[PDB]
Amino acid sequence: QMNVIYIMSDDHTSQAIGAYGSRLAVLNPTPTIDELARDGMLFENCFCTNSISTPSRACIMTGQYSHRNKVLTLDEVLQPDQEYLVDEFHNMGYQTAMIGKWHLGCEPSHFDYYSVFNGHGGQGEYFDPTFLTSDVTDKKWPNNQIKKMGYSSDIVTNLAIDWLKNRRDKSKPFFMMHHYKAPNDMFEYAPRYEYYLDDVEVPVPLSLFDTDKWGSEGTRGKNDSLRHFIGTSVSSRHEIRNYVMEYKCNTGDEMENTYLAYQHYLKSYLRCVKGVDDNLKRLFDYLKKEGLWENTIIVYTGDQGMMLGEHDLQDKRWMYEESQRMPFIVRDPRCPYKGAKSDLMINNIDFAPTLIEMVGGKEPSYMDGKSFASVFEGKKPENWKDAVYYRYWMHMIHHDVPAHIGIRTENYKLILFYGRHYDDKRYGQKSMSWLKNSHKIVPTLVSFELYDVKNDPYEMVNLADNPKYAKVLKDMKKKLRELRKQVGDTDEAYPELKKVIDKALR
Ligand SMILES: O=S(=O)(O)OC[C@@H]1O[C@@H](O[C@H]2[C@@H](O)[C@@H](CO)O[C@@H](O[C@H]3[C@@H](O)[C@H](O)[C@H](O[C@@H]4[C@@H](O)[C@H](O)O[C@H](CO)[C@@H]4O)O[C@H]3COS(=O)(=O)O)[C@@H]2O)[C@@H](O)[C@H](O)[C@@H]1O
Numbered sequence: 001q002m003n004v005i006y007i008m009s010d011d012h013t014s015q016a017i018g019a020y021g022s023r024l025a026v027l028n029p030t031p032t033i034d035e036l037a038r039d040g041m042l043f044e045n046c047f048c049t050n051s052i053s054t055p056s057r058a059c060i061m062t063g064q065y066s067h068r069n070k071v072l073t074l075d076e077v078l079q080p081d082q083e084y085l086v087d088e089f090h091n092m093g094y095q096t097a098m099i100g101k102w103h104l105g106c107e108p109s110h111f112d113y114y115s116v117f118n119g120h121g122g123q124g125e126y127f128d129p130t131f132l133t134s135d136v137t138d139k140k141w142p143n144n145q146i147k148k149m150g151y152s153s154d155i156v157t158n159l160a161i162d163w164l165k166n167r168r169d170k171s172k173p174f175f176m177m178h179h180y181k182a183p184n185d186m187f188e189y190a191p192r193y194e195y196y197l198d199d200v201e202v203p204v205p206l207s208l209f210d211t212d213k214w215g216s217e218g219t220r221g222k223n224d225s226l227r228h229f230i231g232t233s234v235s236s237r238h239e240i241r242n243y244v245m246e247y248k249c250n251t252g253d254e255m256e257n258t259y260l261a262y263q264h265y266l267k268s269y270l271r272c273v274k275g276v277d278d279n280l281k282r283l284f285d286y287l288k289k290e291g292l293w294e295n296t297i298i299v300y301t302g303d304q305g306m307m308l309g310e311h312d313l314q315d316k317r318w319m320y321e322e323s324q325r326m327p328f329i330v331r332d333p334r335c336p337y338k339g340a341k342s343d344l345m346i347n348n349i350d351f352a353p354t355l356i357e358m359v360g361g362k363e364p365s366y367m368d369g370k371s372f373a374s375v376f377e378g379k380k381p382e383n384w385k386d387a388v389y390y391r392y393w394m395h396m397i398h399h400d401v402p403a404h405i406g407i408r409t410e411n412y413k414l415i416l417f418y419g420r421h422y423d424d425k426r427y428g429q430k431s432m433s434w435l436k437n438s439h440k441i442v443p444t445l446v447s448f449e450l451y452d453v454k455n456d457p458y459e460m461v462n463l464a465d466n467p468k469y470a471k472v473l474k475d476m477k478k479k480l481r482e483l484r485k486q487v488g489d490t491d492e493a494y495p496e497l498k499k500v501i502d503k504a505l506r
């Protein structure tokens with residue numbers, strides 16, 4: 001029976017992995033992960049269904065869409081009763097371990113062992129983190145706390161290794177979720193990486209300085225009336241929260257300021273990536289010397305992508321390619337296609353069924369996702385989807401990103417910005433509640449964006465208003481509407497949203 005280690009890093013986006021060949025690949029940002037890929041399978045078209053941490057982690061644990069599992073935003077929590085992935089591995093006879101960032105709000109009580117970040121509401125701290133652990137038994141969760149000194153990524157690795165070495169019943173297979181809190185948003189990298197990339201310019205995306213054909217009234221207002229209101233930015237564009245502000249650039253030329261903020265942003269981020277890649281080398285070295293390399297399935301992914309200055313955007317939440325796509329790599333020592341790529345359209349909701357089937361189980365029938373385990377034996381799964389659904393619910397909060405739904409096929413992406421919050425109490429409250437002068441949560445404009453992702457992979461050119469694409473628009477609207485129905489995301493419980501979205505979809 002196969003062991004499993006599911007490795008997931010916070011906000012580690014596909015641009016920031018060498019094997020995915022972005023403009024950043026020339027920097028060799030992840031040699032260890034690229035090596036994993038060279039001896040594994042790399043998935044080109046893996047998409048988050050809702051790109052923030054807690055909802056994506058709920059989708060992963062439950063195999064269900066946000067609207068089914070009900071963890072819509074960062075404001076909602078999982079129930080322990082919903083820890084279905086770990087329940088399914090328990091039921092197959094595995095010992096189970098949860099290591100690192102949990103961020104699901106409830107106790108990981110369905111695990112045999114856990115040791116998870118508790119500080120700053122589940123995000124944990126980059127230095128001297130505290131953890132909650134099933135080993136502290138004289139206190140009840142969430143007060144069963146320990147503290148460790150030093151850099152968080154190194155400690156996370158140490159927790160996994162210590163469990164493997166001293167705690168696991170070596171007579172049983174194990175299933176472990178190993179979640180790094182880096183690189184995250186903070187980007188508080190370890191001091192040993194201080195001069196990593198000091199002498200190199202990070203490739204800059206053209207879209208950081210040119211957004212001429214991108215977006216729509218839903219993301220910019222009419223004639224850019226909302227250009228300083230929607231979408232936190234790298235440049236000074238966003239009037240409340242941007243990296244020119246945060247990094248205090250003041251050269252006298254705003255374009256220069258944007259450039260320097262991009263450079264600091266990216267260098268800090270990539271130093272955090274480098275910490276994770278180095279720690280992965282430690283982990284894999286241990287697994288190999290312990291005799292576990294050839295009987296352990298290894299997954300490496302990130303909970304969602306992240307905008308690294310593309311279109312002068314930051315963070316995630318958007319359904320734009322860099323935020324929607326998750327890097328996803330699987331090394332199954334049994335799989336013979338080593339260093340292979342798969343273009344299958346998959347979602348984070350498909351992770352649990354696939355893993356379960358990979359070890360001999362059956363894809364759970366109460367899950368929304370399905371198992372593509374057959375790809376590792378060289379067969380496309382039966383009747384598999386050729387398009388993915390996306391919905392971001394958390395209207396405006398934190399980063400002034402409007403709520404939207406969307407469909408992405410192999411050729412086109414259609415986004416519908418509906419600009420509403422599902423809890424109308426929120427209207428009028430601050431989007432960024434720690435800021436005296438925050439914008440307020442208000443309804444934004446309704447609009448469509450259409451991208452040819454085959455010919456315009458960087459989503460530079462919104463096509464929705466080009467008469468040459470009217471039929472395409474029509475077809476994609478039909479598909480969006482039908483997909484929304486197939487997945488049961490029809491908004492009966494939120495009639496305001498239902499009215500707006502149904503009207504927009506003709
Ligand atoms: O998807 S992720 O990868 O997890 O990234 C999401 C994240 O979202 C925003 O940051 C918020 C995020 O970390 C969230 C937890 O999921 O926590 C929010 O901060 C809250 C608390 O954790 C903080 O401690 C702080 O509140 C305390 C406050 O409770 C106390 O009264 O006083 C304290 C004094 O130090 C402090 O004010 O702030 C709250 C804010 O909560 S709220 O925004 O929901 O109303 C994080 O802000 C993004 O900003 C981030 O970039 C990232 O996208």
Ligand code: NA
Nearest residue numbers: 010011053303
């Ligand atoms: Na994240």
